[PDB]
């Protein structure tokens, strides 16, 4: 949708999903054009080139449980020839310093994670933006969880 045809994608989290991270391209200000596909909750790359990859997730909680809570966000690649998932971007956050004691209020907290960087991809690479705790995911508002790529060379 521009004079110089260029692979681009910007998908958002499904608000109707029940405690799960499901990417969609079906709302205002979410796009999926010029060969980039979405299969099995993954982004399929159409051309070899230098891509900008970015993603944001937003987590929310009420209080802290007895187990330590680690929040991870990771963008990974599956090559057309390689074996498994190589991590491109990854970040970890620890929102809970200690368990909410009995008799104390379960006060809410929010934790966003942003990932972005430029990577050379070959035609047919799969890209996945995953979290480790979908139950802490927060898609109460529109622009809070998203996952996008855009080719800068070809």
């Amino acid at each position: 949708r521009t004079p110089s045809d260029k692979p681009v994608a910007h998908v958002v989290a499904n608000p109707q999903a029940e405690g799960q991270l499901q990417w969609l391209n079906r709302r205002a200000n979410a796009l999926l054009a010029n060969g980039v596909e979405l299969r099995d909750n993954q982004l399929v790359v159409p051309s070899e080139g230098l891509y900008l990859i970015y993603s944001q997730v937003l987590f929310k909680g009420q209080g802290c449980p007895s187990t330590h809570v680690l929040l991870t966000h990771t963008i990974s690649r599956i090559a057309v020839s390689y074996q498994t998932k190589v991590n491109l971007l990854s970040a970890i956050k620890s929102p809970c310093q200690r368990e909410t004691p009995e008799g104390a209020e379960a006060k809410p907290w929010y934790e966003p994670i942003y990932l972005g960087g430029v990577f050379q991809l070959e035609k047919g690479d799969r890209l996945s933006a995953e979290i480790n705790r979908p139950d802490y995911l927060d898609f109460a508002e529109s622009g809070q969880v998203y996952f996008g790529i855009i080719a800068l060379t070809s």
Partner: antibody
Amino acid sequence: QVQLVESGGGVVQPGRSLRLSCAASGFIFSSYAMHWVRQAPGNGLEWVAFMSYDGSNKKYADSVKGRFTISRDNSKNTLYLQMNSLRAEDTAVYYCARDRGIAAGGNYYYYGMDVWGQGTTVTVS
Amino acid sequence: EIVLTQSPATLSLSPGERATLSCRASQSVYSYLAWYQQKPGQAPRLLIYDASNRATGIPARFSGSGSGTDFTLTISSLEPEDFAVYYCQQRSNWPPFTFGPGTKVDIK
């Protein structure tokens, strides 16, 4: 010493209203979330309502949405359930229970309802 | 959206035998599942929370296990006090705090 004591149930004609009370004692009531859970005669348990420690999050069962209203008074340390337009299916024993309110994304709640009231009977027919 | 099944509906055993109660969910609920005991004429009583953790003051014969869609409550040796109705509760939001149908345990 940690106890919940309910009151207010009774025999009501259909379509009228009735207000259930659940006074807490022995613990910091203002820090706990609260649930209403009812049990029809000879049936199992059915969750009715829920509210957080300050009332920011309220949840209702589909069968009672639009007719029941859960509320609380932390200075009196009491939980309230307002029941309007009572049908026959609302005839049940009603329990209140406390909950730590520790949750993930406001959707998944850890632990469980550990202390309950003695229950109060509501009969509509 | 989420449907709770409990098998079997009725379990008739003798004191001392192993009791195996099953709770299944139509969709995955992670480990946000609890087990409650209700004796005749009393309020419910929390047995297990978060699938496998035993509540305070609960005898060691009760044990919880399972995750996602499959959960199991095991009583290694039935006592006379244990004959009651047992409910599993999924603690997700869709729909919120739904109880299972319950499993009654009686004598032979």
